[PDB]
Amino acid sequence: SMNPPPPETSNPNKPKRQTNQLQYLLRVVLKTLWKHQFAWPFQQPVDAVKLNLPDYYKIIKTPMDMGTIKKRLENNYYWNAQECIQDFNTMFTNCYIYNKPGDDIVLMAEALEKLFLQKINELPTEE
């Protein structure tokens, strides 16, 4: 079983803008999680081929990861902050669907998610 193509990170047909909320999402929220001890399972799409996980994309139909989110922000793929927040939520949801209580990755996801929520609770004012 092959990996699916990774999520689109650029769309030359979508209008683009910079906002303070998107600045905060890339340079505060994403950066805080990206530099964290537990970031590494979440920095790129799950490679079901190299890791020999042929059921991963049978179970996870909306994959998402912080490498994709980072590239989406850097390519101005998001217009609304909620599009980016939704991607982080999807990434965490996938981890809790595929993995079980007691798995190390679940503990890593919980710690990253706590930090994500703390940072998003300080999202700046909308324009």
Ligand X SMILES: COc1ccc(S(=O)(=O)N2CCCCCC2)cc1NC(=O)c1[nH]c(C)c2c1CCCCC2=O
Q: Where on the chain is the footprint of ligand X (CB under 6 A)? A: 40-42, 44, 46-47, 50-51, 95, 98-99, 105
CB of 42 closer than 8 Å to CB of 91:
yes
Read off the amino acid at residue 39.
Answer: A
Residue 105 or residue 123: which is nearer to ligand X going by CB?
A: 105
Report the alpha-carbon angle 27-124-42, nearest 5.
Answer: 40
Residue 13 or residue 35: which is nearer to ligand X going by CB?
A: 35
Read off the amino acid at residue 101.
Answer: P
Q: How far is the CB of 63 from ligand X (least distance, A)?
A: 9
Q: How far is the CB of 53 from ligand X (least distance, A)?
A: 6
Residue 30 or residue 46: which is nearer to ligand X going by CB?
A: 46
* Chain position whose Cβ is nearest to ligand X: 41
Q: How far is the CB of 47 from ligand X (least distance, A)?
A: 4
For 70, the 3-state DSSP assignment is: helix
Report the alpha-carbon angle 62-38-44, nearest 5.
Answer: 40
Residue 6 or residue 41: which is nearer to ligand X going by CB?
A: 41
**Which structure tokens are listed for 7?**
């999520």
Q: How far is the CB of 80 from ligand X (least distance, A)?
A: 25
CB of 52 closer than 8 Å to CB of 16:
no
